[PDB]
């Protein structure tokens, strides 16, 4: 019992727990599992369902474990016959008004209510009266409602208030006819709306896209990561046969506590549409079916003409580390350094890791005292990250925004809307500057918009000036963070997928352009007489402008490496097999390398992973975030002349995400995202 | 976490009394008599995470759980549709054996099994689960604390007003 | 005997795609996949039974909560090719239509016992 | 047209403009209707049957639906809310598809 730790007795066994735990927390620490319906670790305690009742020797009547604070020398009994009888009675009260909808309920194999009825309930009923009836109301395109099945926990209301922060759901009514939902006809607006479906224990809130399609026992679950944004949310993809049926989050306190954004949750719909299955080679009749050998022959004949920087590579949002290292090695062997990323921040320096990663870990932002957001709308860029910023706002952190006025869930101080305001703040003229200096844990978050700006050098220099003046980076705390909107950006920067000195010094009109999943390229990137090779898995703007199309696997179909905005290396698994005559992308690039006459040394996936480890040692440490040495000041001392070269632009710091639901090829193909966009635009 | 105090008692006791003789890695795989190309397949040793729909902790690595939870799983292979009836067809012999029957109490047990048969394996540790509530809502009392809006300002009092 | 999917007297199929009959099938002879219908009902887009894999235990008739699937009284259903013995939703519905009155009488008699 | 349309629900037991839960069956073949996927003929579909049946007036704000006349020879007992229901917009039994509406809420 060192200081904070106390001792508690659970069923006559000694358990050492901190003083701040409740009875339910100590019971979990003791290995005893208490029946719960309304209690949630990450939500406010409610105490309404009364299913957690245990016995305390001091108390005369059973107490609710979730809300009862544990005390020194407390004896906790979870198996006394009175507790069993109370559990059975509470279960009876829960089931008397429940509808007999088990066959038609999409919670049939995954219902807490059924399982706790079987385990902690009687086998028979004594209710013969009329049951309650509720009329369902629309909550939007993604949430289906059967409020008749609703046991009145408050998990959905507590989530909508504390976490989502839209404050749309409430308990309207009194007594038995009390009902849950918007009193008016309203549609749930948060991009974290899907999480209520998982939070709902009894299927009253259900996923409308995943409606009546499968049962839980039919699905094989594979643990992978979400490439929807640079958060790299940990997910579990459930598949029946060759079809992905649904995507649900996994617990990772480091990155996504247990929440998933709606785009990531419901973009599996676009994995069945506009798919590339076979190699396509252009002819007078258009793009036509071709074998792998013929496409490689055409690419060889095209590359023979091009030389040096005439070969150009553009990587996409969903390209993985292995395919990018493959393309880098192939094009360096051919003799090209024109390797760019589609975003528009092509020339961002990859020299020092601290410059382009979130040096404060996502978990450690919890301890922040003052947070500054520069040119970022964290809501659109990463809804779960905005949820965590809401959590720190709840603790009492003061948040300032130096971008455009946006509807962040929490309240914030609008420091300014243009670069000049950030310049003034960095110089030290500001009350918020004195708050950043005063704070023990100051955090500065710079958005991807600043990275995609024509005047990025001087804005980054101003941000570094603010870092040095306010001392956000110190011993034991690095408060400089850069939030990324794309999964492949941090990996591309890490491997060194950056234009070489020659490419920047002497721009050369590209004669052959290689698109590695890039459907968002600016139209000026391809000179319109170039020979375009598109490698990817959906047919989109990239495939339409391709002389050769090479089918590739998607993130659900390949075991690939992605780096987070914090730089944590995470890996995908093959949930479903590859479709048609498609192949893994790094294998495609290596086969093309053999065909063109520059054979790459690696011939297996572990060899590719070893090459990634050689190029960047942190890639060997999958699942662990590696700290960055603070070298940002030396970099800006190095680029003195360049930051002076950078000019001023008549643009205001704002997000580049026009529509959140469609940002990549998978989302654009998705029908569900299109419905969400139509609902928002009406 | 205390004890099952059932047949599992004799199970564990039989475990601790007896032991297996050490053999070189991969030798048992030849004794098994299965095709040797089976051991070319790669192995993932992992514990399933909790399903987000349910709040039970049985499937997780928790002191409550007394069942084997570490699976050996093989990589997924090609699957197609039967031309006549659209059924899912496969040629993978090891499709469901690992998920269904290869359950182990401890990661070292599964690693020992894989090394004994000669399967190359990668062990994935589950993301740690810590049941720690946040400081804002650490307890039920915190819901109705002064933290919500601060201490009530008394400048509205008639004495202070007048 | 031979399986048959049933309809309500209005003409609406009794099946609600609970998928219990597919979960209880000892021989794995039933494959079911469903969707939301345009009206909003929970209906199957596929219900096929392999009669060369069926063991005619009747467990699927026991598990169905709405009496949608029943084993009819017909034992003259031999075929000259194996493909005709892979039934589908349309064939099962036709078999239910053909034997409706006899099945209904048998169910009325059986309801007393269970 | 149907190849790029968003799957929608007519709204008999759902709402007029909601998404329809859809699997990927028939997506390759090119079929996009529920009945088309499993029926290849030109006969009357069971949905056509259920639409033809008309809503039934009841007294009260709740109706007990057993699907069939005998409780043990049909769907499980269901209690349907009659609030906010009229002939044009009736309540529906999820098991059977029968439609109900009542005038009692209007104090009649």
């Amino acid at each position: 019992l060192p200081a904070d730790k106390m001792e508690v007795f659970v069923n006559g066994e000694a358990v050492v727990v901190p003083k701040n735990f409740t009875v339910l927390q100590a019971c979990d620490a003791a290995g005893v599992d208490v029946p719960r319906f309304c209690y949630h670790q990450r939500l406010s305690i409610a105490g309404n369902c009364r299913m957690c009742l245990v016995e305390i020797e001091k108390a005369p009547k059973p107490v609710a474990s979730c809300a009862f604070p544990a005390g020194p020398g407390m004896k906790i009994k979870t198996d006394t016959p009175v507790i069993k009888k109370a559990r059975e009675g509470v279960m009876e009260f829960l089931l008397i008004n429940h509808p007999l909808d088990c066959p038609i309920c999409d919670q049939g194999g995954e219902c807490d209510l059924q399982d706790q009825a079987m385990i902690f309930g009687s086998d028979r009923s004594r209710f013969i009266e009329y049951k309650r009836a509720v009329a369902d109301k629309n909550l939007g395109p993604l949430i289906k409602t059967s409020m008749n099945r609703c046991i009145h926990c408050t998990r959905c209301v507590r989530f909508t208030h504390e976490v989502a922060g839209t404050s749309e759901l409430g308990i309207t009514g009194r007594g038995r006819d009390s009902e849950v939902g918007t009193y008016i006809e309203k549609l749930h607006s948060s991009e974290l709306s899907g999480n209520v479906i998982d939070l709902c224990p009894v299927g009253a809130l259900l996923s409308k896209p995943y409606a009546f399609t499968a049962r839980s026992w039919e699905l094989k679950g594979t643990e992978t990561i979400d490439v929807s944004d640079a958060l790299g949310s940990n997910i579990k993809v459930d598949c029946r046969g060759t079809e992905v049926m649904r995507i649900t989050p996994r617990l990772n306190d480091a990155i996504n506590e247990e929440w998933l954004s709606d785009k990531g949750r419901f973009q599996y719909d676009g994995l069945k549409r506009q798919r590339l299955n076979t190699p396509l080679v252009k002819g007078a009749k258009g793009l036509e079916n071709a074998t792998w050998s013929a496409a490689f022959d055409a690419i060889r004949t095209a590359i023979a003409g091009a030389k040096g920087n005439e070969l150009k590579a553009i990587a996409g949002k969903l390209a993985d580390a292995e395919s990018m290292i493959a393309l880098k090695d192939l094009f360096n062997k051919l003799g090209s350094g024109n390797l760019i990323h589609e975003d528009g921040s092509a020339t961002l320096s990859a020299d020092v890791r601290s410059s382009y990663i979130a040096n404060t870990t996502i978990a450690s932002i919890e301890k922040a005292d003052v947070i500054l957001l520069v040119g970022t709308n964290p809501r659109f860029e990463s809804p779960v990250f905005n949820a965590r910023l809401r959590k720190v706002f709840l603790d009492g952190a003061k948040v300032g925004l130096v971008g455009e006025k946006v509807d962040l869930t929490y309240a914030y101080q609008h420091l300014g809307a243009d670069v000049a305001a950030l310049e003034s703040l960095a110089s030290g003229k500001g009350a918020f500057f004195e708050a950043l200096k005063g704070a023990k844990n100051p955090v500065v978050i710079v958005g991807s918009s600043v990275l995609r700006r024509d005047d990025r050098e001087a804005v980054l220099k101003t941000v570094n000036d603010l870092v040095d003046a306010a001392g956000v980076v110190k011993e034991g705390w690095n408060g400089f963070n850069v939030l990324h909107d794309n999964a492949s950006r941090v990996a591309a920067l890490d491997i060194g997928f950056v234009p070489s000195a020659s490419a920047r010094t002497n721009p050369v009109p590209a004669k052959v352009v290689y698109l590695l999943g890039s459907d968002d390229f600016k139209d000026e990137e391809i000179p319109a007489d170039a020979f375009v090779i598109y490698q990817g898995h959906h047919g989109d703007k990239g495939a339409a402008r391709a002389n050769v199309v090479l089918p590739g696997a998607a993130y659900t179909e390949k075991a690939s490496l992605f780096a987070n905005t914090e730089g944590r290396v995470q890996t995908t698994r093959t949930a479903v097999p590859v479709l048609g005559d498609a192949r893994e992308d790094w294998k495609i690039i290596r086969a093309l390398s053999e065909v063109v006459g520059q054979q790459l040394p690696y011939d297996s996936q572990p060899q590719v992973r070893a090459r990634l480890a050689e190029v960047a040692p942190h890639f060997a440490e999958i699942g662990k975030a590696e700290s960055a040495l603070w070298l940002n000041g030396q970099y800006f001392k190095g680029v003195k002349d360049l930051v002076a070269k950078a000019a001023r632009s008549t643009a205001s710091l704002a997000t580049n995400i026009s529509n959140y639901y469609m940002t990549d090829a998978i989302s654009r193909a998705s029908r569900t995202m299109a419905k969400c966009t139509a609902v928002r635009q009406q | 976490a205390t004890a099952p105090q059932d047949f599992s008692l004799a199970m564990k006791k039989a475990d601790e009394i007896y032991s297996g003789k050490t053999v070189k890695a991969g030798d048992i795989g030849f004794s098994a008599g299965v095709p040797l190309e089976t051991y070319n397949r790669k192995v993932r040793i992992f514990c399933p995470a909790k399903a987000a729909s349910q709040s039970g902790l049985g499937r997780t690595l928790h002191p409550s759980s007394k069942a084997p939870q570490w699976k050996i799983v093989f990589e997924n292979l090609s699957k197609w549709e039967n031309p006549l009836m659209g059924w899912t067809s496969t040629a993978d012999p090891l499709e469901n054996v690992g998920r269904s029957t290869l359950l182990f109490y401890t990661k070292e047990e599964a690693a020992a099994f894989c090394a004994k048969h000669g399967w190359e394996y990668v062990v994935d540790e589950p993301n740690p689960r810590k049941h720690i509530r946040q400081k804002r809502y650490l307890g039920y009392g915190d819901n109705y604390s002064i933290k919500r809006k601060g201490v009530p300002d008394l400048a509205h009092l008639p004495s202070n007003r007048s | 005997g031979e399986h048959a999917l049933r309809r309500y007297p209005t003409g609406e199929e009794r099946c609600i795609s609970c998928k219990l009959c597919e979960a209880i099938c000892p021989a794995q002879a039933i494959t079911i996949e469903a969707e939301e219908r345009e009206d909003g009902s929970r209906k199957t887009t596929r219900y096929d039974i392999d009669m060369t894999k069926c063991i005619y235990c009747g467990f699927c008739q026991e598990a169905c909560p709405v009496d949608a699937i029943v084993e009819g009284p017909n034992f003259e259903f031999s075929t000259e090719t194996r493909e005709e013995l892979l039934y589908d939703k349309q064939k099962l519905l036709e078999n239910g239509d053909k034997w409706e009155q006899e099945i209904a009488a048998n169910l009325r008699t059986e309801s007393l016992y269970r | 047209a149907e190849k790029n349309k968003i799957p929608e629900t007519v709204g008999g037991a759902a709402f007029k403009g909601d998404l329809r839960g859809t699997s990927a069956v028939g997506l390759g073949d090119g079929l996009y209707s529920h009945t088309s996927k499993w029926m290849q003929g030109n006969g009357k579909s069971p949905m056509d049957y259920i639409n033809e049946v008309e809503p039934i007036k009841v007294k009260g704000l709740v109706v007990a639906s057993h699907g069939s006349d005998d409780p043990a020879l049909g769907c499980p007992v269901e209690y349907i809310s009659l609030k906010g229901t009229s002939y044009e917009n009736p309540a529906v039994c999820k098991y059977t598809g029968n439609r109900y509406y009542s005038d009692c809420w209007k104090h009649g």
């Binding site: 046969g241 079809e243 069945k272 007078a284 793009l287 | 039967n82 659209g86 | 493909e83 | 390759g28």
Partner: peptide
Amino acid sequence: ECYNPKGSWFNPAKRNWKKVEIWQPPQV
């Protein structure tokens, strides 16, 4: 010769039970 599965050669509209829609390249 009345009943055959929908994937049969005899079926008027034979079914390839593919669960993915494939991109159609633009004309010319």
